[PDB]
Design a protein around this motif. Sequence first.
Motif, PDB file in Angstrom:
ATOM      1  N   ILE B 237       0.814  -1.305   0.074  1.00 12.18           N
ATOM      2  CA  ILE B 237      -0.025  -0.100  -0.008  1.00 12.18           C
ATOM      3  C   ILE B 237       0.940   1.220   0.092  1.00 12.18           C
ATOM      4  N   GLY B 238       1.946   1.312   0.822  1.00  7.45           N
ATOM      5  CA  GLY B 238       2.803   2.395   0.469  1.00  7.45           C
ATOM      6  C   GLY B 238       3.235   2.537  -0.764  1.00  7.45           C
ATOM      7  N   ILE B 240       1.561   1.832  -3.737  1.00  5.81           N
ATOM      8  CA  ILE B 240       0.475   2.337  -4.465  1.00  5.81           C
ATOM      9  C   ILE B 240       0.369   3.843  -4.078  1.00  5.81           C
ATOM     10  N   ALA B 241       0.326   3.939  -2.801  1.00  7.95           N
ATOM     11  CA  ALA B 241      -0.175   5.560  -2.380  1.00  7.95           C
ATOM     12  C   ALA B 241       1.067   6.462  -3.118  1.00  7.95           C
ATOM     13  CB  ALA B 241      -0.018   5.756  -0.756  1.00  7.95           C
ATOM     14  N   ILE B 244      -0.207   6.706  -7.127  1.00  9.09           N
ATOM     15  CA  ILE B 244      -1.840   6.470  -7.792  1.00  9.09           C
ATOM     16  C   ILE B 244      -2.355   7.806  -7.129  1.00  9.09           C
ATOM     17  N   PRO B 301      23.033   8.166   0.372  1.00  3.38           N
ATOM     18  CA  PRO B 301      22.074   8.895   0.226  1.00  3.38           C
ATOM     19  C   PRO B 301      22.806  10.293  -0.430  1.00  3.38           C
ATOM     20  N   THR B 302      23.901  10.805  -0.062  1.00  7.45           N
ATOM     21  CA  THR B 302      24.511  11.919  -0.528  1.00  7.45           C
ATOM     22  C   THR B 302      24.573  11.765  -2.123  1.00  7.45           C
TER      23      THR B 302
ATOM     24  N   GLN D  47      -0.527   7.621   4.643  1.00 15.05           N
ATOM     25  CA  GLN D  47      -0.611   6.536   3.318  1.00 15.05           C
ATOM     26  C   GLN D  47      -2.034   5.751   3.235  1.00 15.05           C
ATOM     27  N   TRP D  50      -4.391   7.504   1.344  1.00 17.06           N
ATOM     28  CA  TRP D  50      -4.096   7.370  -0.172  1.00 17.06           C
ATOM     29  C   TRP D  50      -4.574   6.045  -0.670  1.00 17.06           C
ATOM     30  N   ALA D  51      -4.590   5.006   0.147  1.00 11.86           N
ATOM     31  CA  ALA D  51      -5.064   3.692  -0.104  1.00 11.86           C
ATOM     32  C   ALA D  51      -6.516   3.569  -0.203  1.00 11.86           C
ATOM     33  CB  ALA D  51      -4.528   2.698   0.971  1.00 11.86           C
ATOM     34  N   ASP D  85      19.377   8.273   6.344  1.00 13.32           N
ATOM     35  CA  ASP D  85      20.593   8.853   6.014  1.00 13.32           C
ATOM     36  C   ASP D  85      21.220   9.924   6.996  1.00 13.32           C
TER      37      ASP D  85
END
Lengths: 404, 404, 288, 192
Positions: B237-238, B240-241, B244, B301-302, D47, D50-51, D85
């Motif tokens: 679901i994370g 899709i959100a 969409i 991440p840099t 979220q 959002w679902a 990070d």
Amino acid sequence: EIITLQLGQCGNQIGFEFWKQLCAEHGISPEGIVEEFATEGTDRKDVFFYQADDEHYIPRAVLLDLEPRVIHSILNSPYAKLYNPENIYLSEHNNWASGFSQGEKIHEDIFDIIDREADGSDSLEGFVLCHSIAGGTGSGLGSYLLERLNDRYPKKLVQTYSVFPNQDEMDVVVQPYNSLLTLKRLTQNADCVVLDNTALNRIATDSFSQINQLVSTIMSASTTTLRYPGYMNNDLIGLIASLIFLMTGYTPLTTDQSVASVRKTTVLDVMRRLLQPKNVMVSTNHCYIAILNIIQGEVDPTQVHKSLQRIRERKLANFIPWGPIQVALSRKSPYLPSAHRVSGLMMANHTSISSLFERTCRQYDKLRKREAFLEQFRKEDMFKDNFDEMDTSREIVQQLIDEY
Amino acid sequence: EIITLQLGQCGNQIGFEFWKQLCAEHGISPEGIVEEFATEGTDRKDVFFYQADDEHYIPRAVLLDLEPRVIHSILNSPYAKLYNPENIYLSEHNNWASGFSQGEKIHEDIFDIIDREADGSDSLEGFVLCHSIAGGTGSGLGSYLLERLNDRYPKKLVQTYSVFPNQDEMDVVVQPYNSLLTLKRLTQNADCVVLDNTALNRIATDSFSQINQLVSTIMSASTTTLRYPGYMNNDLIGLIASLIFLMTGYTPLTTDQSVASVRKTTVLDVMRRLLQPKNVMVSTNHCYIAILNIIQGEVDPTQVHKSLQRIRERKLANFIPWGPIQVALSRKSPYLPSAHRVSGLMMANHTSISSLFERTCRQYDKLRKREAFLEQFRKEDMFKDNFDEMDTSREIVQQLIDEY
Amino acid sequence: PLAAHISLVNKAAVDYFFVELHLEAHYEALRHFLLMEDGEFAQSLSDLLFEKLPGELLNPLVLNSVLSKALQCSLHGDTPHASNLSLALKYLPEVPDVLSCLELRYKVDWPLNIVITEGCSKYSGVFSFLLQLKLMMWALKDVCFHLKRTAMAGSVQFRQLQLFKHEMQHFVKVIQGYIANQILHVTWCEFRARLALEEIQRAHAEYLHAVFRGLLTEKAAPVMNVIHSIFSLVLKFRSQLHPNFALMQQSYNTFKYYSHFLFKVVTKLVNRQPHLEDFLLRINFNNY
Amino acid sequence: ASGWAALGLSYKVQWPLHILFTPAVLEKYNVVFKYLLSVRRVQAELQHCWALQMQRKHQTDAIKWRLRNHMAFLVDNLQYYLQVDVLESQFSQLLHQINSTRDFESIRLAHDHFLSNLLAQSFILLKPVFHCLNEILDLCHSFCSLVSQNLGPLDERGAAQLSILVKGFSRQSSLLFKILSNSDLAQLLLRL
């Protein structure tokens, strides 16, 4: 303790394979000897067997038959020596009236055998009957024995595994009469397991050897907890009280070749599977009356509670509106391989069974209007004068259907 | 947890190679056994597999097909024993109407299997569907299953890997109808991965075994982080959100022989490569709606921030004027060789996909004006009276194109 | 030089108990007899005593001998452990109720008496309850068997009567299924995988303290008080073995009210005990 | 008083590390767990909405939801970045300072400086930013509830309540923007 009365070819075989399953479970040698690995066994054996001075164990079984061939073949099997020759009975020399007439004729020796067997048990609990309701032998002989037994022993249970004739297949041309009369006697005397070839062979698909192996599996799984004492449900009467006509289903009905799919089998999935009409081995918003599920293998009561909760919420079942199931647990025999992680057997009382009789009644009414195949019946004394017996039986079955 | 519904020859294969990739990643033996080196594994297995009392792991997969040949071949593979014979279903005995009619006919057993699989998972998250939209089997059967599933389970996700027919190549003569109807159902019921043979084989160049190996690679890389828990994006679901209709691309789509060029592969170069139309495996200033890049291997991440900054300044992408990407990081399985220093997968939503339907609509309109190959459709009940279904589907697709 | 010798003595002290004096056997043996885990024994002891029902059934000639007749029908026991089952009493009854006070005390010898405390008397507390439960499943079995011989006689007065038994039996067969889950299986999972010298005293004092999940604690006592109202009405139902049908119809209606009251008193006692949580799931299933 | 505001996790340390993990250092750890859980709570909550919006595919003003949801999403999701990070970067130094110096005195200082960085890097000690983003935190609770507390369009004073937050959120949005204009360079880059 318990006694088994098996009649007709159907009953004779049923008994053969039932005792095969039992001896397999309890580690009883074909000759009645006990294997070395099972010397220290904890399983209770008195329930179905009684030991002998020769250390061999003898079943509490009696063989009855109008014809010799089946039992003669049985005594040529490797299991022949196990049975008690004294108890076995064979007629020296296909109709219900003839069967009941013979039953009247051979009362003395049969009840001699039954009394001898009964007096050897301190705490006999009930009776077990295996027979077919269509053929002449099983129907009439079971009728006579049930009548004279309920008369003789008014304080013992009477349990039967009655096999019903196939209907989609057009076997006994005179089946409606025998079935109707046997049902009369069952309602009027039987304490408490319906069986039909149609749905049984349907599930077998999707020889009589395999069919009756399945039937014996059902019987043994039904009697497991009695055989294997635990905490609850330590008696047949406990079983009957928790339910009271029945139908049955068993989940792990898998061929010896179908073990390849070792499916992770919870208790929830099993108990669920026991509910579907497909698994019910027998063939108006009809609903249930009672449900019992006996579970073999490792089982966590938390899992059982969760399964019960979920099924209740999912409302996959329907109950009577006028009255307020049961899940019992047992232990597998320590000998047969535990190919199944957890297994389930279900016995239930459901109103839909009424339809069975409605068919047979419809069958019987479809003949009584034209007097078909009554010539042989008039021969016997019981139907020598009239057939009021038939009318009373039909009205009794109609009353039972109305009650359902 | 998750379930996979694969239909038609395309879906059946897709599933075969997807599970091949999965078992390779998680160190699952072909027979379902676990290798010694992977005994102490940390990877999460419940997502796609459930273990068995025999210690073997079984996929949460169901096989569906109108024809036996493909699955019969599957069961002759070294991976045959892995699947669950109970779940697999084969029709005892190329049109969408026929497929939907059969789906209406075989509702009961399919949903029995689906319910059995569902009840074995505590935290089922959604559904995965693999099928082709052109052939009769996949299109109609997927339509029926999607309809009855969205009806049955209104609180589960439905994800599909739909394979679209080649267009430059003139395969299903009746493809426009099946494609249009399947698209209707996808819009009307599908929660959320478009696929086409044309561009897929184009990138493959520049047998079905290799094509679907690439497709399975895409699927597995999409589900990696779910399989391998981390910090962020710990659920479908994370995913899709954060987005969409979709299209996909994978950077390290390199042959087993093309490892000779061990090119120093930063994260910047990968994420850049994921943007080009060439790598988009599918074939008006059209722009993006959403972009997600999942990166496997060592990542700083840099470096990610620097790459994002530079790409933003270089304006290599275009976005909607009326609304305000995402770069997630995962960990490779500890088993498969890390021939790639860092790898990247991209899933995006872009308006240009509209063109697909405009082609198919153009195809469909190019037939409905002359009533081509409607004879078979009239045979089935659904199109027995009229074809209003077709008109509604076409108007729905037109509405979707207008919305884009 | 001290702690190195303390661990060796204690480890040799505990090991001396198991591999030589069978401490693991005594526990898994007293449960076979006191907590009635072994069937064909309680179903044979209680079944004998209930056949009689004052001056009889109280002298050491019948109750001190019914045990020696019970152990033979056990098919499990008849060992040195199986002895020392003093079936004694602690009260002289004068004369429909649900009470028959009677104890059943184990006996031990010196090197084991120092661990199993002479107060851990609490088994006798949990025993008299479990025996009282058997009095239902036998008396209720009687009316189920007493009615069987009555069977021709088919009318509304008959079928409507038998539905009461199935409606009352199920409530006993579910409260028993609860007891057969808490006091014999889950509380036995602990204290069996818990063991494997001072700890043996406390671990045992925590195993039995079986009396908490058993609804015998005074904290949840009001839940137990209501059980008697249920058990009493079933006994009255056994007295009237259709000359007095209506006299029984009123009795069943009192039963359906009290049961409907139990479901509310247990629910209100959830806010204030995770042990009781499983009870509501047992008593209630597809109802309110 | 909401229950989440008092939640915490304590750890019964063993004997050898009893000197390295005092009730002081084991307390600053807890404060991080309190905050990091909150951002996790609002994100997982956000979220799910959002679902539902994507799920709610079958109003010219209801579309203002996602035009605000995504605004509230990017500010939150990428704020939830810089966390993988700052953790996996500060931690990867703490573990490297361990396997380098054979001395133990360094560990008591390397680990101590590691902890102080998390309180400093994650803006937990910086009061102005921590008192502004906090307003963004409970802000999403209101919005996400608003979408979940119904299934119809925002007509029954929901729209009247909807335009309330955007006048504050977008104000709070650009308010934060001036704050960042040492350590914010790693953060503001992602949003920009």
